[PDB]
Design a protein around this ligand. Structure first.
Ligand SMILES: Nc1ncnc2c1ncn2[C@@H]1O[C@H](COP(=O)(O)OP(=O)(O)NP(=O)(O)O)[C@@H](O)[C@H]1O
Ligand SMILES: *[C@@H]1[C@@H](C(=O)OCc2ccccc2)C(=O)CC[C@]1(C)C(=O)OC
Length: 349
């Protein structure tokens, strides 16, 4: 089997000519050539079966991305794994090949207002479809916004995605321990339940701010420092803001901090389009119930030159997982992953 940076990529003979792209905390991603369809592809290798939480990420990503079909959301073309469950140690997810991601782009390039506007439009267009299926992405960030040579944008990395159900869901804390928290909504760090579609809008606002300045707007080292970054710009929460914190210990924690004045957006972004800052203000609202919704954002004057609801599709029906996964042992999750990937095996019946 072909080898990339001393790592086995056992994907031949169909997929050949592998080249390292990059990696996240869980997967190593290569470009490859599909000799059957005669097209370029991306291939993500993950090795999750020794960790319950990694098994959760793999099963969630596979189940959701195989049900979604949208221009601004990455698709899964193929999945490779061993013919028996005992032999299955790695999973290879084959996707359309993109050229870069927004994290890498912002490291080398400053974006014009027209590019910012277009990227933001495509993010929200994809997010509109995700939310129309009653799904929360929960981990939006520059590194999982993929870009191609023609400036098309696709959202990827759905391992933390969940069906929205604030009143009856008990996900608890984001059991994610290796990746960045700079894009996480304040209520995530203050509460362990009741997450709504507004958490994704907060993330998009953080991404907008970073496109405006090429620097992350709230780059804390831990949740403690992270909250101080947020409050240092939004100012101390209002009385109504305090009423939306459910955890009384978290509310009493916020009450114990010194007072902080709000910083005007045009002090942070003095050269930015005023319409961009108006939309930014409505996305980075402390109170999730007052935060702008995805359809309202698409209709905001900042995005006027691209907004087109006739060409902003939605899901036919809200997505469902068909079971809860948080309490299953990793051995059971391994069986579910095997079953979910059997449709890509020869002889599936
Ligand atoms: N289809 C793709 N085409 C091109 N590059 C891709 C593709 N999928 C992923 N990448 C790159 O690979 C990186 C890692 O992918 P990702 O799906 O985020 O991996 P992960 O380890 O499972 N989760 P995370 O730690 O959140 O990044 C991305 O940030 C992109 O740079
Ligand atoms: C997109 C690309 C480009 O020229 O896009 C033109 C454009 C104008 C207005 C609105 C939207 C797009 C460019 O020059 C920068 C590279 C970029 C960002 C791209 O190729 O992404 C990888």
């Amino acid at each position: 089997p072909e080898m990339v940076r001393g790592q086995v990529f056992d994907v031949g003979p169909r997929y050949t000519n592998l080249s390292y792209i990059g990696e996240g905390a869980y997967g190593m991603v290569c470009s490859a050539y599909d000799n059957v369809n005669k097209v370029r592809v991306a291939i993500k290798k993950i090795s999750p079966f020794e960790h319950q939480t990694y098994c959760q990420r793999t099963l969630r990503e596979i189940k959701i991305l195989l049900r979604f079909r949208h221009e601004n959301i990455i698709g899964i073309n193929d999945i490779i794994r061993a013919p028996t469950i005992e032999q299955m140690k790695d999973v290879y997810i084959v996707q359309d090949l993109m050229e870069t991601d927004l994290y890498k782009l912002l490291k080398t390039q400053h974006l014009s207002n027209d590019h910012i506007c277009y990227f933001l439009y495509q993010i929200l267009r994809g997010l509109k479809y995700i939310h129309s299926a009653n799904v929360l992405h929960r981990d939006l960030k520059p590194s999982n916004l993929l870009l191609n040579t023609t400036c098309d944008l696709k959202i990827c990395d759905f391992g933390l995605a969940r069906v929205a159900d604030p009143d009856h869901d008990h996900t608890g804390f984001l059991t994610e321990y290796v990746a960045t928290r700079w894009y996480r909504a304040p209520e995530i760090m203050l509460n362990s339940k009741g997450y709504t579609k507004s958490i994704d809008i907060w993330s998009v606002g953080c991404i907008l701010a970073e496109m405006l300045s090429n620097r992350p707007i709230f780059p804390g080292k831990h949740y403690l420092d992270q909250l101080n970054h947020i409050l240092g710009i939004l100012g101390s929460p209002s009385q109504e803001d305090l009423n939306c914190i459910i955890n009384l210990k978290a509310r009493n924690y916020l009450l114990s901090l010194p007072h902080k004045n709000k910083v005007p957006w045009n002090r942070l972004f003095p050269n930015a389009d005023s319409k961009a800052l108006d939309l930014l203000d409505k996305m980075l609202t402390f109170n999730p119930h007052k935060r702008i919704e995805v359809e309202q954002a698409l209709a905001h004057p900042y995005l006027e030159q691209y907004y087109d609801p006739s060409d902003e599709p939605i899901a036919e029906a809200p997505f469902k997982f068909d079971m809860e996964l948080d309490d299953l042992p990793k051995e059971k999750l391994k069986e579910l992953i095997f079953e979910e990937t059997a449709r890509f095996q020869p002889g599936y019946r």
